Design a protein around this ligand. Structure first.
Ligand SMILES: COc1cnc(Cl)cc1-c1cnccc1C(=O)Nc1nnc([C@H]2C[C@@H]2c2ccc(C#N)cc2)s1
Ligand SMILES: COc1cnc(Cl)cc1-c1cnccc1C(=O)Nc1nnc([C@H]2C[C@@H]2c2ccc(C#N)cc2)s1
Lengths: 674, 674
């Protein structure tokens, strides 16, 4: 357990060493092992992979990723495939419960995210606690493992972690590069004739959908079917249905992939391409760091990605998906350029990824100081300086500025020893940023004086996150909705801060510039708009109806779903720890409702993993109002209800699943829950 | 199953026929059997009796009395020993669920309450529903059995119910009434020396206590010990403790019994007198219709009870407690009189009880019409008139006046069929009086607009009943508390309607006369005072502290406990049916908290019947924060916690229980719950 850090190109079985190491450590020490992943999709996929590979050894595998969480305690778990933020929260609660010895390993995947990134600092602080706790209390207690592409400073990261080093550039499908004599039609025809796939990358969504249509149009003009029809049917019965352009583009082995689609549509398309049913896939920058989806030939439309050259870090992972290890001999990555873009293309072709930063007055240091002090591992100034040396910024004097910032905002109390009073303790358990916890405290306390219980809108407004611009708001449609709103919903609007004057300004006048810090009241109206969207969401109305009514597309609505559910859970824990029992009670149901977008009645029924929002309504309409009820039922009954040998449904991490034996697992899983 | 009605004097084994009939009917038809009792204490005692007598035959016995309820569905039950008000709700839910045939019999005890009483009309409607449903839908459908003293119109009741008749005046201990009018100490000494008890009845609580005190003083001047010391210790360890006067009075074979004491203290005194440990017991009019507590010699302080002649029914039920069937040969009921009271005493000696009335524009007929229409058993005028004939008022034209009152208040909708819209459906399920349901609807709807979640006070105010004057309010102390209140509690006070002007009027000026109907705002301040008492109650503060802070004694506080818990449950069901999910969620926890007067944390721990509020705190302080946790524990551990052969604890319906085996049963019952 001397830790470890290694790097290797993707599509080279780099995770295999990690799987062997985790298997050995869990089997030997009988302690936990966190598999930290950057994204929720890759976390889901890895959780399914580890479940399949370790089910036959009595090893529980259930991670904390997105808004979801295991239906069993952390004690029973053996491997937790969590995301960075949720792994940080897990470690915080372990420290607070003084059960840190329960862990025996922490694997981290795609470690290059530690650098310039809006989540990397969470990984940095997450790893900084492990080394500190190990060195204060013993270096064989917790093994750390890492992965990445060719990092220029891999040795530096290993030195920070006190771990070994392994760096290599190997891949069974070598990539070639050579310029050889709009020259795209012939390329596509010759690449499709040889029975190989193509993965094209586009900078934007609209043009990504546009060109996919015309590629299929050329394939149609110049001219397995059963499996493509199967994918058609699987796409047809979805809460959002089948797209108008996708329905005509798919028949010709052409598809597109972007955040605009739903998670289910993305999963369907990824599965179709991986199986080889889809030959040409126009993806976007989102897929670059997405699930493992190798392709024979990668193509890049243009280095310009959002008014600037393509990120070099993104290009490496883009090219990594050029070559299938096991069926392919060689892989290619074509980067078309222009006269002005020739310089940018040659610049991007050469040169590896940039060095890793630390991103540590900054809110990250405030979070770190709060974590260590509330955790009870750094209470006095003498030791808090050692934490600074433990960081990756150090190994590569702002503590006092943050420590006073916390005392200024009453997060902690000085005594010389430091302690949290109530808000620091509640801020750490909620895994909320201490910067926003003051605003959250004010908004909750204000709510508990004049709360509105007629509808869920006042509860939704308080669990509505606005830390990112999840969508562009059309203020004319928002004004129309405001006009059509009921009075009950307008009372909460007045309570929160919405004013008809501001909406009148925005409906006709240009979007008011928020030049001044006092103009956070622009955020109030965006928050109210988002909360109305969330209300229509948990009301179980179809995504298309929410799209027409508000303008946000289904992919944005799903991202809002996940963010709102995560925020609702965080706020519920915040209220629980603060001693606000009524607020906690009102908030508790909402995390699951937001995760699944369901009504109160379906909440007890979506406990079965194999039950979507639609598949929970059909069973509820039939009469299965409870998982226990759904267990007591013949399989054929559920089969006929689902219908009212061919695979038509879709579930995350599925297999040869049809309407027949899908009903078999629904009842079987319900029995296990009981 | 041709029904049955019979009467016989108490103290003559008169309930045995009912036990045989219920056993036969449940064993044969395998259908339920409600055992309706007037009071909650007698309902509890009868439930324990039937549990003991029918445990060995696989017959479940758990009734619905007071705020309590069985921890298992009504389907699993076989005998429900309910109180009159809750039996009506049971029948209403059976009718609304169209499962009326599940019932096999309905026994009713002490039917004289059918007449002039604030609960008899519920009995009348309850039996009218049975007769109506039986006659509309038929030999062995639902048997009805009644009990009473010598009713002048027993045959009339039998004719109404279509049942047989049996009336007899026989008792094993023939009572000898002989009025008589120095020799006081001689009488006391000669009655006590005979080794027989005395049951004195006194109207005034304070004078009853002083009379018991001076009897104990005479015994002390003129002057088993181990068992009496055991009763001392049992009284000592109570949430309210031991009274100063009771301490000096109990060890001379003298005790007192009045509503001022707690239910537990009343139980201790009743058990001590029944066992013979207590020789003289000064009770009040409450015990007259209370648990079966026979004595050898009954005495009455004076016919005058509350500034009026004593009710003949009360005297008739009082005399029944003079003579023990099995150990006594003869019994006496002496009635001291004066010169002016000689005529009143002579009149009271002769003449049986007054006839049974009906007490049916009246709110009772509104409730009846609502029950039948919402139940779906009388939807059109043609049949609602038959319900009038079904009643006891008829058998011994206000329907239209009531029906319009319901349409006037939107309780039902006309179509010529009738139906309920939403408020009628929610009014019958909640078992609330339709008169007060409009005020409740207004108060709930107003509350949800501006609800205060900072504390429980706003939730308590909405589950505070004020249909009776549970105590006299001291407005000076109320003003002191008001000026000492926190601002959070004052915001809800302003929201509900409390005004400093009215409290200023009441603190010095005489209680304002509520001559006008518009002065229900006097009820707002009484409701707020009661809700503050209830908040101090559910805060788990000792009864003595609530007494000094508010002036209401512990017996009044316990009556308020029960009434508030019952009302909270009714309001929770009302909100549930109305579709107010947030209000229902906020209200749900409060029913149990009010029943037991405990905090949220103890609510999962008082599920074990053998766990008082104090016995739930001691275990919670130890670490047993859940019934499942309390199951996983050794008996000696809980024994030492309880301590920190002698029967010192008390529980409803106890046996030779001590600190040792009480801990054994606590864990055993917890296992059964799981
Ligand atoms: C409390 O914040 C959340 C609540 N809801 C959701 Cl949906 C998401 C979050 C969240 C949001 N942003 C960042 C992080 C989190 C987060 O950390 N969430 C967690 N979910 N479970 C956790 C383990 C707490 C439990 C535990 C750990 C160890 C042991 C032991 N021995 C026992 C219990 S942490
Ligand atoms: C709903 O009003 C209450 C709620 N809380 C409490 Cl503490 C007391 C009351 C109450 C207050 N004042 C008068 C009457 C009541 C009352 O009616 N209480 C009830 N308690 N249990 C009931 C039956 C509900 C259960 C049932 C379920 C299925 C079937 C069948 N098949 C039959 C019955 S009704």
């Amino acid at each position: 357990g001397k830790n470890l850090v290694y790097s290797a190109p993707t599509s080279a079985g780099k995770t295999l060493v990690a799987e062997l190491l985790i298997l050995k450590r869990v089997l030997e020490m009988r302690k936990k092992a966190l598999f930290i992943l950057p994204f929720v999709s890759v976390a889901k996929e890895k959780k399914y992979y580890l479940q399949s590979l370790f089910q036959e050894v009595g090893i529980k595998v259930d991670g904390y990723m997105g808004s979801t969480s295991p239906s069993r305690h952390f004690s029973s778990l053996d491997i937790a495939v969590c995301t960075i933020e949720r792994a940080n929260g897990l470690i915080n609660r372990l420290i607070e419960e003084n059960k840190m010895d329960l862990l025996g390993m922490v694997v981290v995947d795609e470690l290059h995210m530690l650098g310039d990134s809006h989540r990397g600092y969470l990984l940095e602080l997450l790893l900084t606690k492990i080394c500190y706790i190990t060195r204060k209390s013993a270096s064989n207690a917790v093994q750390i493992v890492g992965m990445s592409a060719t990092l220029p400073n891999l040795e530096l990261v290993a030195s920070w972690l006190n771990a070994e080093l392994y760096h290599t550039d190997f891949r069974p499908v070598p990539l070639l590069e050579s310029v050889k004599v709009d020259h795209v039609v012939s390329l596509c025809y010759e690449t499709i004739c040889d029975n190989h796939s193509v993965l094209l990358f586009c900078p934007s969504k609209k043009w990504c959908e546009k060109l996919a249509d015309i590629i299929a149009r050329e394939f149609y003009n110049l001219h397995e079917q059963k499996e493509l029809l199967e994918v058609m049917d699987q796409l047809r019965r979805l809460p959002s249905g089948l797209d108008s352009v996708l329905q005509k583009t798919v028949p010709w082995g052409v598809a597109f992939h972007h955040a605009g689609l739903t998670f289910e549509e993305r999963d369907i398309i990824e599965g179709a391409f991986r199986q080889g049913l889809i030959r040409v896939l126009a993806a976007t920058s989102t897929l670059s760091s997405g699930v493992n989806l190798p392709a024979r030939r990668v193509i890049i439309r243009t280095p310009i990605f959002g008014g600037r050259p393509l990120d070099i870090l993104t290009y490496k992972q883009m090219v990594g998906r050029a070559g299938r290890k096991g069926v392919d001999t060689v892989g290619e990555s074509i980067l078309i350029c222009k006269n002005s873009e020739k310089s940018k293309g040659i610049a991007l072709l050469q040169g590896s990824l940039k060095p890793v930063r630390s991103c540590l007055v900054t809110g990250s240091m405030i979070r770190a100081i709060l974590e260590i002090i509330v955790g009870g591992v750094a209470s006095t100034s003498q030791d808090m300086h050692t934490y600074a040396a433990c960081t990756f910024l150090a190994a590569s004097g702002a503590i006092e500025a943050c420590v006073m910032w916390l005392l200024e905002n009453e997060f902690i109390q000085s005594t010389k020893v430091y302690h949290p009073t109530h808000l620091g303790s509640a801020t750490l358990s909620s895994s909320l940023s201490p910067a926003d916890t003051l605003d959250i405290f004010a908004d909750l306390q204000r709510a508990m004086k004049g709360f509105v219980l007629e509808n869920d809108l006042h509860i939704l407004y308080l669990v509505t996150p606005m830390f990112e611009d999840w969508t562009t708001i059309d203020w004319y449609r928002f004004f129309c909705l405001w006009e059509k709103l009921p009075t009950s919903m307008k009372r909460v609007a007045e309570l929160v801060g919405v004013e008809e004057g501001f909406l009148a300004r925005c409906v006709k006048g240009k979007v008011v510039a928020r030049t001044e810090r006092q103009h956070r009241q622009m955020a109030i109206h965006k928050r109210f708009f988002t909360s109305l969207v969330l209300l229509d969401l948990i009301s179980e109305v179809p995504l298309r109806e929410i799209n027409q009514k508000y303008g946000c597309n289904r992919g944005q609505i799903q991202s809002l779903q996940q963010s709102a559910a995560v925020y609702a859970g965080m706020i519920t824990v915040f209220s629980n720890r603060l001693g606000w029992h009524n607020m906690e009670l009102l908030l508790s149901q909402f995390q699951k409702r937001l995760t699944f977008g369901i009504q109160r009645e379906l909440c007890d029924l979506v406990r079965v993993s194999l039950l979507n929002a639609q598949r929970a309504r059909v069973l509820y309409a039939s009469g299965f109002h409870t998982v226990a009820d759904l267990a007591r039922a013949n399989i054929v009954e559920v089969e006929v209800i689902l219908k009212n040998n061919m695979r038509t449904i879709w579930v995350t991490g599925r297999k040869g699943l049809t309407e027949r034996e899908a009903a078999a697992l629904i009842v079987e899983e319900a029995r296990m829950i009981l």
